[model samples]
Target: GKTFSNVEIFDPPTNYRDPQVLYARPLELSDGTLLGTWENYSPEPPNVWFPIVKSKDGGKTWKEISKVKDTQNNWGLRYQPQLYELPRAFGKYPKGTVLCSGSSIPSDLSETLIEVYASRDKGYTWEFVSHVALGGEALPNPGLTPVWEPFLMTYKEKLILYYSDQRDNATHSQKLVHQTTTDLKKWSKVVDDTKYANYYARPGMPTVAKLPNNEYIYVYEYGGGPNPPAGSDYWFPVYYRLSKDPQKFLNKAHHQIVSNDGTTPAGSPYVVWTPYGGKNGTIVVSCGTRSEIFTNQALGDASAWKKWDVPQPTAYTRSLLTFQKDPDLLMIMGAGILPPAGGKNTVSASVVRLSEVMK
Candidate 1:
């Protein structure tokens, strides 16, 4: 049953610092205009960027539109902020061109770069297009060495860049990686998209979407702790991996979404698929709170996942959009609440019409 509309886009500054707007990425350009960005823990300044916004009526309202800095490392593009849109024309950048990958630390987290920015208009100007992976401290701990959640996809003409690796914390303490590029200057090596020999199994915050005929789902957050004794009440549950080729995904089988009133979507997972809930459409999923929003129209089958409620609150990665011309609308956005139960969130968005939530 669909009935949602929240919409607040940005709000932070109860004096600002520690005023996070954490991970609120979006992109829907080519005219319909709706480009958003996030993760700007309100300036302690050693440099940081990523606060772009804009909406023409789809997200109901959003403004700002510009700010993707850190220009090739002075360190500080800071923390997971994807937002891609480049359909074809790789190398010299053409077809809509609107990249914007993130995580470029420093501010005493010592260094964990994963840059790459390029706007070409639509996002109103940006450039710094390199620095793929560096890692060495930023703590996700277990021998520390960072490189957290980046996720940018394209695959086939190349430009896949999923992330979250603890740089071989001496063999699997955290993994779920990917890297590819036709020409964002060359990057293609780290593969293993999810691994575990239990160095304390971490599977990290990876994400990917695309389904129907070609197929692909890929999601993450299996941080394996506290017994799987049926969701031991959460330790990062949410796992998925249905592929047809998203770099083939090392051997597949991750599942664990389970929602049909039984409750499951644990940590940061944001997937999107929707032609509209029929013909194998409707696959939305948002994670880490804000009530339930998981749905699956049987495409990745295995008990078809179901939970639907929505209003918008907690968001670790929750930011989705679907509407090429209103393919049942499906908006659902988020911000703040990341890190020891953060506060002062303030960016909300909502809209659900999966044909009336696929009732």
Candidate 2:
């Protein structure tokens, strides 16, 4: 059974329009502590670790841990940031530390490279490690430019860091690729069927998790077809691929796990293993909500999405949920604040008993 609801964890003012959210590595520290990171709205100049907000009480409240002001400071580019940790409960490093990736635009005169940062003291501190691009000066291709939406994953004792790349020297829209690393120092590019050059298979926001059997589950931003039936702005859908080898997922079963046209336009996708016991499963995928109030629109013009009159939380940055084995309760995070009506735009949490909602 599947059900959906909104639980308000944190809300940003108009200042924080695009909220880039992710769950922290479920690990405690030397002093017995928990850590989480929320990098929203590309803080000020060069946002690295702008607000590594820490929530001690599950996902209720948060506190600032660290900040990265500029890239030249050696903290790495502060644009598209993501955090990674061990997923399986039996991994060799199950309770390791946190490794955050601060992604940057491709260098103008150089190859695709990313700024990698590791935190032994949780989000409270960080240390710069290396800068890696597609193949850099070593690969056959040199024109590839790296982009954002760092979907960090780990499987088979390897860290699979996926990112979008603008291969062509023309536009910024990316063709996504991933690299595997055993020590976070050396990364091997995961290419299948020369599909990296194809346009139809481009995926963004790639997130990975290790199944109980140690197999890999790679989920990212992809879709079933082209656009919505009403011709609305349909950006991306969340898709999953299962791989026994942890690197290759070029199979027919590797298809849409969730769709935007079916329910909502979910673009930014991030999955996390449950730290607290719920009703049934322990792993779930959290999605960003991009719903349209208006159903029908022109062919190309899909702007004014904020004007749609579909539901209460008209436009939510983080507003969707799904469970693996079906959850006991769906915890949704967003503002119950509707515009010019009964609701106010403040952060609040909502709960939906899955057993009751799922029919």
Candidate 3:
């Protein structure tokens, strides 16, 4: 019953109600148009720090680049802001394209930065590349605990950063880390010695997709522990783990492809990896997919592969999947359910069309 057509982008004024999601990138700007970035907020001025939207015509009308500053650091809360475009590293110089990395978040810190903005033309002229964290300069951990929203990928060629940092799991208090480097100053550390490179269970907000044969995907939001009946620690679901061998260092077999609800684990999910493909070679995975279940294994799903009709699955947190981005034309990003409270709890921004559903 759900083929497509679910556009809203932003809708919440009745005092606002958790449009809570703040990152989406499916870029293509250089005059060619097509750009994205939407941070959410507004629980009746719960802190208010929303402003950073820009879309050409893919996600429909949007433009607000600036005007709501002091997000996280100011404790004004900025939520999540990630914008990336390397353009093949500007074709090796000559000033063609460069808008390297742009991410900003909130995850309890004393010094956990991953906010860098740069662009010469592609993105339109901007500069501020100098906050890599851990003593800056580039890779210097041991401190800066609660790191959130990092996920920057360039793999194979080097440069990979995924964070939600704060690991202490043995029984589970925290565990969602990843630190790799290609020369971020030799940044490749995660000692607990799982083998050589470990960390992929997702305690929260993780989104990484880099597989062209190189292999390496680590999706997050794997519901917290000690919370159910009287266990307390809910909100999560959307786990994943992969590695065609990141150097023998892997924690567990790491093949948990999916785990939607054993206690609310899809609350704040996000993953995109479509370059183009379909017809048996599917690829397109957009998931804001949430249901908030907490216990009883989150009910239903007894075990069905494909079933449609979702106008209101308890307000449907955000869902749109078509394979996991395999060939291209993978459009995903959800958070829609609005219509006289018929399916309340909106976040407004829903899109899906991976090559027309992998035709």
Candidate 4:
């Protein structure tokens, strides 16, 4: 059997009152313990929060460890969350401290606030750290600027936070930006990680993975692409840039993640470079609309692109992480369909040994 592990992290509402658990994110600790957190859209509680779960014996089983609630405003931690673990000490939080960031918005969907919370005891509890950015109404309607999606990465003792912003008529409809911090409280100014000169072009969802020899790969959904693939409300063809340094990705040229036979991945795109495969390892990508994953062994060379059918449902922004204990064993987690397209999904996760699926 190709799929070795399957576990339902969370379930949908039993009745009409339950909230659809979507956008399930995964993180692997250095000690082989796994951590996960997702969007909790209840509309049933006071100020909502994101729940953190842990799986000790791979990903077959899970248990709720803690809850990261919004302490900032009455709006509550709304949507688009990401989980990250520190490799070394930074500012006040030590190495191994878990950091969680999400879009905290009010019930009226009147505002979007991207805030950070830190937990010292794995995923058990979290304390408010800082605010990355704030914008207007949460709705994606015209004239209302909103911030969505937050991704965290560490480089040179600083934390780099990336997100999608619709706050500026100065640029275009939407753009991808990032900020840096040594301490969670103090953050750097917003830097444009990906911005289109064309007013119609929209670039969102920034995911970064490093390859051998300090090479970096940045992947995101390019909604402005000419070919808006079918079955999607808007075009979200996967686009990426290859760079030697992660700090400067704005100037790099981007190319769509077209697989063999000229098939391009659609919707939310996530990427990770695994240490298995070959000398250059492998650069793996998962798109929201497709069941198959796109990969490259030649450090993201266009000709090296290939696809493999995975054993999980496609959710908006599926989570991909190579096991910290066994890098060859990859785990894909999903939360059903994207809400914009009618979501009735659960927080389910499955594990597949990379060799069994691709090679």
Candidate number of the best lDDT: 4
Query: Can you give the lDDT of residue 238 in candidate 1?
Result: 83
TM-score per candidate, in order?
Answer: 0.33, 0.62, 0.28, 0.95
Report the C-alpha lDDT of model 3 over 159-189, residue by residue, as the tens digit.
5555554434333333555565543344567
Query: Candidate 3: global Cα-lDDT?
Result: 0.42
Score each candidate by Cα lDDT. 0.79, 0.45, 0.42, 0.83
Give lDDT: candidate 1, residue 150. 87
Candidate 2 C-alpha lDDT tens digits along 163-231: 655554243234556666776666675453112333443456566655444455565666323454466
lDDT of 4 at 57: 80
In candidate 2, position 186 carries an lDDT of 64
- Candidate 1 residue 79 Cα shift, in angstroms, is 6.8
lDDT of 4 by residue, 1-359 (tens): 32454578887565423346778899998788889988877755667788888988888788988888988787788788899999888888999999899999888788899999998988877899888899888875545699989999888778889888888756678888888988888888888888888777788889999899688899999977766756755687899998887778999998888888788887888999898888998888999888888889899887779999877877778879887556788889887675443445688888887788885
**Ranking by lDDT, best first?**
4, 1, 2, 3
Query: Per-residue alpha-carbon lDDT of model 1 for 1-359, expressed as tens digits?
Result: 32357778888766555646777878888788888888877566658777898888777777996888886667677788888889887879988989888888877778788888888888889998788898888888787878887888887888899898888988887888888989888898888877888787787888788988788999887887445655364387887888889987768877788776677667888888878867888788888655568888888785978886665666677878887877788777777676543456877888777666656
Worst 10 residues of 2 by lDDT: 296-305
Q: Rank the candidates by TM-score, best first.
A: 4, 2, 1, 3
Tell me which of candidates 1 and 2 scores higher on TM-score. 2
Global fold similarity of model 3 (TM-score): 0.28
Clashing pairs in 4: none
lDDT of 1: 0.79
